[PDB]
Amino acid sequence: MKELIYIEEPSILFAHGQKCTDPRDGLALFGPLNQIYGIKSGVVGTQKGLQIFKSYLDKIQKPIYNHNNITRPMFPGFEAVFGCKWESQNIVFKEITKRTYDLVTLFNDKIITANKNDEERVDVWFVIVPE
Amino acid sequence: CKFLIVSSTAGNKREGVLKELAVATKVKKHLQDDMFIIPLAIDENLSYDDINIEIVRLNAIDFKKSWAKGLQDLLDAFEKQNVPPPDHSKSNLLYQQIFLHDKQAIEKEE
Amino acid sequence: AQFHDQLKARLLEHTIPTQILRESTLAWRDFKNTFGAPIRDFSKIEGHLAWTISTAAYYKAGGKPWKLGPGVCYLGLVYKKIQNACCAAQMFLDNGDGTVFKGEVGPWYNPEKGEYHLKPKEAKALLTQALESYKEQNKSYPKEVFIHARTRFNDEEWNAFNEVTPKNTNLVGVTITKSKPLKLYKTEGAFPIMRGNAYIVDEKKAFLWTLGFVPKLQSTLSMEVPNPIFIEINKGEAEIQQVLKDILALTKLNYNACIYADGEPVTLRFANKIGEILTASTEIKTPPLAFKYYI
Amino acid sequence: RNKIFISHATPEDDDFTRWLSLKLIGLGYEVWCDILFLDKGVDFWSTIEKEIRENT
DNA sequence: TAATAGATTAGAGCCGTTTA
Numbered sequence: 001m002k003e004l005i006y007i008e009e010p011s012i013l014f015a016h017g018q019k020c021t022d023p024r025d026g027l028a029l030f031g032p033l034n035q036i037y038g039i040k041s042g043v044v045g046t047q048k049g050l051q052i053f054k055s056y057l058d059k060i061q062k063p064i065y066n067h068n069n070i071t072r073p074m075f076p077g078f079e080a081v082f083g084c085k086w087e088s089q090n091i092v093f094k095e096i097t098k099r100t101y102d103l104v105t106l107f108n109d110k111i112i113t114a115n116k117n118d119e120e121r122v123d124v125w126f127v128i129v130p131e
Numbered sequence: 132c133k134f135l136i137v138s139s140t141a142g143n144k145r146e147g148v149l150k151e152l153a154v155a156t157k158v159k160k161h162l163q164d165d166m167f168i169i170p171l172a173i174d175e176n177l178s179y180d181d182i183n184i185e186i187v188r189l190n191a192i193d194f195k196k197s198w199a200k201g202l203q204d205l206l207d208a209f210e211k212q213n214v215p216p217p218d219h220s221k222s223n224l225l226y227q228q229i230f231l232h233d234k235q236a237i238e239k240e241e
Numbered sequence: 242a243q244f245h246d247q248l249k250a251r252l253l254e255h256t257i258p259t260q261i262l263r264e265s266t267l268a269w270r271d272f273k274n275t276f277g278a279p280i281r282d283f284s285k286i287e288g289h290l291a292w293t294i295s296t297a298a299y300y301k302a303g304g305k306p307w308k309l310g311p312g313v314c315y316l317g318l319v320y321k322k323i324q325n326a327c328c329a330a331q332m333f334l335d336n337g338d339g340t341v342f343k344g345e346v347g348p349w350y351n352p353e354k355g356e357y358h359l360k361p362k363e364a365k366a367l368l369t370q371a372l373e374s375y376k377e378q379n380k381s382y383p384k385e386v387f388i389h390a391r392t393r394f395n396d397e398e399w400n401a402f403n404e405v406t407p408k409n410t411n412l413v414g415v416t417i418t419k420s421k422p423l424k425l426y427k428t429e430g431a432f433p434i435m436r437g438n439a440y441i442v443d444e445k446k447a448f449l450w451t452l453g454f455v456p457k458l459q460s461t462l463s464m465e466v467p468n469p470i471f472i473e474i475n476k477g478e479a480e481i482q483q484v485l486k487d488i489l490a491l492t493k494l495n496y497n498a499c500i501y502a503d504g505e506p507v508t509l510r511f512a513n514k515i516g517e518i519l520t521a522s523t524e525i526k527t528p529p530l531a532f533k534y535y536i
Numbered sequence: 537r538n539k540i541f542i543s544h545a546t547p548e549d550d551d552f553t554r555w556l557s558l559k560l561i562g563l564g565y566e567v568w569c570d571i572l573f574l575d576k577g578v579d580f581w582s583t584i585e586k587e588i589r590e591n592t
Numbered sequence: 593t594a595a596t597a598g599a600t601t602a603g604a605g606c607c608g609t610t611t612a
């Protein structure tokens with residue numbers, strides 16, 4: 001009867017130096033290590049895609065509850081957890097109106113021209129792809 | 132010092148919270164300070180109407196959107212009202228005492 | 242099929258963090274199966290979804306979500322089939338205790354069709370790139386190089402590794418195998434083995450349950466029955482308990498999502514992702530090497 | 537009686553009133569605004585009356 | 593060159609969302 005040893009579960013550090021086990025609880029309790037001032041969201045997609053991302057971001061600001069909350073902890077909200085603004089009213093939008101290659105080049109050219117030409121700074125571009 | 136009452140749809144009409152709120156208003160009257168009881172409205176379905184009389188008179192803190200903005204409102208209201216060295220280690224050591232007691236790796240042969 | 246990976250590969254030249262979001266994910270209610278519940282039923286996980294993407298955003302906006310708790314350089318390398326291309330992911334601890342979790346990129350090309358082993362020159366180049374990265378981050382060469390992969394390390398590449406390395410630097414090779422059929426159940430309860438238990442097979446080999454029942458979540462990281470990952474010290478001299486602890490720690494670096502833990506090392510997973518992205522498109526000199534451009 | 541009161545529509549006009557109040561305090565005048573100085577967890581209408589007909 | 597196994601390896605896809 002072979003003995004099963006146990007490795008104590010490692011603890012991940014969070015803000016102010018506190019360590020927790022679940023990333024969700026640690027993030028919702030102490031917050032992330034470094035503070036960024038906010039996310040300048042960039043959207044590359046169709047108008048319906050922008051509307052969907054707008055609505056989902058607005059829902060992200062408020063808490064969203066899982067069907068079962070004890071196992072997977074709920075989301076207090078982005079501003080509540082991470083502490084940096086990611087509002088939907090500060091979005092840099094780029095509308096789009098070998099086949100995979102051309103579909104890729106569309107978004108690639110949009111992102112290239114928006115990061116090169118446009119004066120608005122985007123922390124990270126979100127490619128909202130249709131379905 | 133302060134009495135924050137959660138003002139959701141379920142939390143504004145339940146008996147226990149109602150009695151706690153009632154004794155809270157009694158001790159508020161005894162303390163003679165209007166800056167005692169703070170409603171925290173969190174529920175989208177519950178408007179500022181249909182709320183309880185005992186808290187309808189008072190100014191709520193808008194937790195409906197962006198709980199962290201309501202948290203900041205709570206913080207600067209507390210600083211404005213002189214509500215009495217912050218250390219997150221206390222909460223860190225307290226989190227597993229109560230919230231993780233049925234959820235832990237207890238020593239037992241299996 | 243290759244839409245996301247080739248998008249990121251083409252975006253690698255000009256450093257711009259990007260997150261690809263399918264419309265069926267952000268608003269899964271309106272897309273349906275046309276005969277009942279929606280195609281992607283995210284109701285049980287919506288908040289969790291709202292967790293993960295948020296972290297992804299916060300990871301691609303230059304924010305560090307969490308640290309880990311010296312002198313050890315973890316180097317997880319993964320092979321990609323096209324000719325073979327080896328791409329690695331490195332992590333260590335900075336002198337300020339910061340978790341440096343960059344990559345080890347500039348993929349190394351083994352011309353053999355099915356030899357998942359780096360040639361002596363490519364192995365030397367990969368290892369020395371990792372060592373100089375450690376040197377420029379921590380101001381000193383690593384004390385111990387925990388180099389791991391999903392493949393056994395052949396003799397010639399091991400010799401190349403130990404000749405390119407400098408003195409006082411012990412590097413140990415670790416092999417991680419997924420889908421190894423050892424389905425260890427639990428006789429008494431209805432819930433599988435708790436996560437973190439390890440069955441040692443040999444002084445160099447063992448089975449670790451990096452996934453399974455988590456007491457903290459009262460549920461399981463894996464549906465059905467967990468599949469333990471085989472951790473074998475095929476090369477180098479190291480304690481298997483220490484290797485299991487280190488790999489359990491490495492299973493906490495999943496910044497691409499917000500989940501309590503993942504079943505395989507995050508180094509290997511992220512190296513796989515960066516390798517797939519690199520092989521998606523044409524060759525690019527000095528790839529960005531930071532995961533915010535890939536995951 | 538040394539105070540300035542500014543009434544406004546709350547949901548829509550906040551930027552103008554906030555800017556006006558901030559400039560007024562910068563100029564040294566004491567101001568009272570419901571979106572700046574009206575306390576949380578307090579009878580708002582009673583305090584508005586007190587400020588209007590006591591110190592304004 | 594083909595085949596017959598074992599050992600490793602890699603891809604791709606596909607559905608559920610972790611029993612309260």
Ligand SMILES: [Mg+2]
Pocket residue numbers: 497536
């Ligand atoms: Mg990803």
